[PDB]
Amino acid sequence: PCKFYICSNWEAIHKSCPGNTRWNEKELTCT
């Protein structure tokens, strides 16, 4: 819930959100 995935060519790369934020699917950004 504090990382998401970046898709590229049906390829899931791992990202993590900074500090105490969470991924916000609506805004497509950790908030």
- Show Cβ contacts of residue 2 under 8 Å, excluding neighbours closer than 6 positions: 16, 17, 21, 22, 23, 30
**CA dist 8 to 11, 13, 14, 30, Å?**
5, 8, 11, 19
- Is residue 16 within 8 A of residue 2, CB to CB? The reply is yes
Instruction: Fill in the amino acid letter for 11.
Output: E
Structure determined via: X-ray
> For residue 17, what are its two tokens?
């959100």
Over 1-31, what HEC string results? Answer: CCEEEEECCCCEEEEECCCCCCEECCCCEEC
The experimental resolution of this structure, in angstroms, equals 1.7
Structure-derived torsion over alpha carbons of residues 1, 14, 17, 2, reported in degrees to the nearest 10: 10
Instruction: Fill in the amino acid letter for 3.
Output: K
DSSP secondary structure code for residue 31 in this structure: -
DSSP secondary structure code for residue 19 in this structure: T
- Is residue 15 within 8 A of residue 6, CB to CB? The reply is yes
